[model samples]
Target: SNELSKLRMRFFSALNHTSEIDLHTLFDNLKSNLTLGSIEHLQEGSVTYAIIQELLKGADAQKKIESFLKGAIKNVIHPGVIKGLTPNEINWNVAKAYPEYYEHEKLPDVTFGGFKVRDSNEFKFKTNVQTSIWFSIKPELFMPSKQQEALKRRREQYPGCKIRLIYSSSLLNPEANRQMKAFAKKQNISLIDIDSVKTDSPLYPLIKAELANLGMGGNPAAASDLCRWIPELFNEGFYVDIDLPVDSSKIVEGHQITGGVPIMLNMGSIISEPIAPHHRRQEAVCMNTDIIAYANDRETQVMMDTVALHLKNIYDDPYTALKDTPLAQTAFFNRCEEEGKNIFELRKGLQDAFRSDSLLELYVFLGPAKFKEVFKLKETQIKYIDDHISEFNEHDLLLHLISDNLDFGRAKVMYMDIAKEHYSAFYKPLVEEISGPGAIYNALGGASNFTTTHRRSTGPMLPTTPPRVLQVFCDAHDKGPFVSDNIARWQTNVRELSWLPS
Candidate 1:
């Protein structure tokens, strides 16, 4: 009917034009636009159904959309006014008012104490950092001959701003750090520093315990805590990983300033009984702490505290905790919700940033299964990307070189081979990098001294899965069952074979 068509057009026009739809506009229109009692039972493929299909992208989109509109009449009558409402009543009223709602209560008489002055000379950065922090603990990451070109790229991108490398662990080559420490001074642009957890860090015990467990050869993962402590200590800055070859300043400008990036909310929390309410799964939203920007605010404290919680979880059961808990990312998300933050995006790397480049059920449900599908290269190479690799272009192939989890150190070798065999012009530099004297192979001491790195002098990096497991995966690759079918099978054998450490 033309009447239904009018409603659909009106809803879309409103949704698109406004920055975001709020309760007042949404509820008021639902009363005028949709039949009140019949609104709850919106038929499939109807105008109202389609509108909801567009509007709700959450897990239970249909149910939430339906429930949201049912109590619209009362809230529309109240408009935006609310006074002396109980907590339950407040939640109920807001639920009545807003189609998409995450409860936010305003704080009363809140005051934030400023960061204490460590020294007059210490760097106090601007609130939202345009400066990119090229963070790493891996020594070979920068020192390798191949990465020399990348460092030049980083230096060129933001010539004026200081490109600081903050290391949380002992460098594989301490001499390299010494050189960089002086090099930063020579250029007056690059800065190098080693940051350790303060004696009074919130997770002091956990950090202490982790340091003790990992021993002198430092755990590289701990470097991520810089995001929490960096802003608190030195103020705001953009954090980028060492390996992502990008024009750093553009990411800082586009994501931090112009376009809002996604903050990950725990999709696991919506159903889990053990971890729901406030602590559901992990936090309210998980920002990719690796590459994120934030001001030194109360919400930033939430991010730091989340790191504290993750460190504590690490103390309990390292593997299981990581497998189950949301970790620092969730803590940031939940805290923002607690403190009334509006998040517009997902993790930004793969998940939803908008409606078109939307979140997929494959990723949400199947996990690694979805990962395999994306790597489905053409039965033969066509110049075009084809559907499987449409997410990335030829220029961005390095980012997707490895499968999500089960690479078993083959991605580098695979890249090296591919660079040599096919894409000589582009990947040759990378091939030389991994196959170089002091690279990933040497980092693990090649096949000869693998056991020295793994802490055993006799066994495999994976003990049970045999010397032939590598061969098994390669053979499966020839058959080319999707991208991951063979890899999954190889992984299953790795698990079932039951080795030293998974």
Candidate 2:
């Protein structure tokens, strides 16, 4: 609280430089790449494990890191996030009293517009747990007002419904799971872990990407190709990608429906004033989409059967095929080809597969109750993000996080508050922005993925930014080599941009 505004720049105000850069140019470069860093941090989480391993093994790695994170936020899983959970205070008695809120027939109502209940008695509605909602969060998209209103609606409307939340990501966390188990027990929640969501499909693509890079004779770790496949892991969920300021506009224009799925459309709030970062989650702002929309049409029943079989096949004997260190080699190639190019001869594959585009159709199967209506817009939710960032930075908790006591123990409250406030304050713009004219919606990496990235040990958790001289150069001037007409350039040949003369 003393002087964070002055020091936020320690992390924010620099660029990841290209060799032979000045300070100003370096800052510009890194700034341009920061947004991408979020994506890279998310998509490239595997490599970060290796980076951390190396960091732990090295002598100077600690010192190198101290240079970057000396004063700023050191994100670690909070007790609340890892072990504690928001109070499960949603009154089930209310629902028990209002059976209609929880009531469902043996079949999903075939009544329809974009969606039709293909089955008369196959889904959970027969048992009265109708919604199999499953949507992922991009917290920046939620606002405090909208979250409060929507969650309140759920608490009042669906008393008996057991709203389950699933965190989707490829981050492997047994320890976190231990904590999650405890939290679920305490919170009275159901947890479905889809960790390693990427490997669910990309286990093959990781090998394929290595092959493609090698086949092209390009940099093996150029880091593309495989990340796009991560979105395919879920059969029935909305895959959202976003830009915060630009997000709010699209959510509203889309008529709360995309294809046929209901949408939350997100907005976010400020950081300082912390409530439960997660509150009666099923009770909160953005409505979650149901993951398993299993119903039985003659065709749909077959699909459900096939899906179960596929899930079985994936986990049935999975890792046996993978090479020792997949990030380094292809599992299939290393096993089948054994060309010693296990590191090289990537699998040439995955075109003409029906499942490719089917991934985006996850939204079609999963729908949320809150998403069924229009989101209420409020100002406090929109402040720094929606209305006045230049004014107070309202609730961006990271701004308040500068207290230096921001450690593992304190982080949970901090993160949840920020996350909750995010839902409360800014979720409306996301639906509004993306639903209409200039609005476009994209939601790929989320809180689960972010938590995974932050906790991952094998990857390059922190980026290796450029030297100070280059940073200074980027800082003094308004331009850099990469800042051509408007687009930010990336290093195609890392060697060419290397400070060391190879």
Candidate 3:
């Protein structure tokens, strides 16, 4: 919590532009904080050399990058400029473009590491940031009850540091934007409206399909047409994706920079930085986001040096004359949705396991991340974490915890009391199911402490299976006692408390 108050000035500048995340503090922290050579040690296969040595692999990387050509050429509405129109046809173009590194690797993941860079980058980052308070917007809201309660305990926790809400284009509106700005102004909130409409969500695919048909003629130059409609950023803007929050707040005092901004954190790791780790996601999964679409378009424009380079890097040049085309941004969405179900399953599995106990009972909890806090977790009960999520630490902590077979059911659960003290307290009961066991432990934070919160002493009797009850809390902050608690459905504490043992 100690200052370098000068860091604030740097923070204002670094976060001013929205191209990246604010790394002001992260910069200071990184300079002094050492990685003990872990990151360097992990680099192999010329990856470190690639960045240091500067390998401009050329359009070969995107020879089949028809995703760009889809915008203006192949997907054009009618009488397009780009040539070629078939799905299988793109491969011929990819082969012609990347004759150098394309290597016939059919599985996109096989040709180049998609999510690998992300994995490596996150691994490195986790070691760097460790346990710190970060404010997110909305469900992952930037400023929420936890922060409010904590601030009450000690305003100095954040010091001069302030949180801003990074509103996503597809997820926001004019009224919401106005309200956000007003709220930020009242409390000095940073209205991080770095929103460029990446997509229309449900309609992005349809538009992409129509665009793909026309090819290069119908290409969207700016990421999203809607992003420009944003009112404009008041505070220093950090053009970062909503999900990629940064913990690098530390910066230096009186830094007389240069003409433009300095190449701060992940400088080369910008969307075009050619997929390297140590800074970016080692394992990169290129899904369909208006963000990715923007990146793809930008990269395509940058790679063309000649007519051949343009033809070499792009796949849909032939279809630049068409009117209708096919795009699978929708396909990717469905895949993500279907595969995303595992996240729900992971949550549901943990809930079921928490309600009951023991494998023999047919109820199960999976993944260590989902283990109930203070709720005697079976040495075996844990949740399987989905990789690619930025939050999970590098190590397979859940697997490690499982393999150790350690039961941490009695760990102390924490809560922000009505007084906003981060200690412990009982939750406001619903009168019916919200009672003794349910009241305090379930509402606030509980471990094996609240056996009574389950089912109810009268309503329904569950088996003697180990109770998966975890710390619980209220959804909204109750001044009297409900702050800082994650109650039942809200996953306020009721969700499993997963953490690496300190």
Best candidate according to lDDT = 1
lDDT of 1 by residue, 109-173 (tens): 21111122111111211212323333333564434444445555655654444455544334435
* Per-model CA lDDT versus the true structure: 0.32, 0.25, 0.24
- Model 3 has an lDDT value of 0.24
TM-score of each: 0.32, 0.19, 0.22
Residues forming the 10-long window of minimal summed lDDT in candidate 2 = 474-483
Segments in model 3 whose C-alpha atoms lie over 4 Å from true places: 1-142, 145-164, 167-182, 187-341, 362-502
Scored against the true structure, residue 92 in model 2 reaches a CA lDDT of 16
What lDDT tens digits, residue by residue, belong to model 3 across residues 1-502?
2344444444334233222332343334433322211122112221121221122233332223223222212222111101211112223233334335333323211101111111000110011111112222232234445534543332133234444434332233456546545655765544433333243233234223322322222222221221211222211212222223223232111111110011111110001222334443121111111111101122222211121122212222212211121111112223323454322222233233323423211111222222233223554343332232235442343333344333333211111011122111111111101111211122122222222222212211111211211100100111011112112221123212111000
Give the residue spans of candidate 2 off by over 4 A: 1-124, 130-157, 168-179, 196-293, 296-299, 303-502
| Candidate 1 vs candidate 3, TM-score winner | 1
Candidate 3, position 127, lDDT: 12
How far out, in Å, is residue 274 in model 2?
A: 52
